[PDB]
Amino acid sequence: PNLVLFYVKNPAKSEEFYKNLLDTQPIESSPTFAMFVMKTGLRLGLWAQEEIEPKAHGMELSFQVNSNEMVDEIHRQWSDKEISIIQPPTQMDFGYTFVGVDPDEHRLRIFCLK
């Protein structure tokens, strides 16, 4: 479920960098997003900076969950825990999502894919 998200200026060029670095093909690529999955299991996404909401000022630690209801449930838990939230549950083009931040402004995203 875990996914490291890097904001990138150009997903096409970033994807080539990582394909070369990792000597691995991305499992998915597009003009706006590419995803690499490590044999070890770590998942790395490269996401066009211009596509990010909330607007990007350079990465996120993200958690993929099973349904929109699970997204809402975690949102409730995080509110109860007093975790700063910078984007409430929202229908984006790729699915349903919200984002919090830690005490050092690292973004933490929960999402369920369409």
List domains and CATH numbers for the chain.
Answer: 1-114 (3.10.180.10)
Residue 54, burial from CB neighbour count under 10 angstroms (0-12, 13-18, 19+): exposed
CB 71 within 8 A of CB 111: yes
Longest dimension (CA), the chain: 43
β 43-48/2-8 pair status = parallel
**What's the resolution in A?**
2.1
How would you write 15-78 as a 3-class SS string?
A: HHHHHHHHCCCCCEECCCEEEEECCCCCEEEEEEHHHCCCCCCCEEEEEECCCHHHHHHHHHHH
CB 102 within 8 A of CB 78: no
How far is C-alpha 48 from the geometric centre of its chain's CA atoms? 11
**Positive or negative torsion for Cα 23, 26, 31, 33:** negative
Report the distance separating Cα 30 and Cα 85, nearest Å: 29
CB 11 within 8 A of CB 46: yes
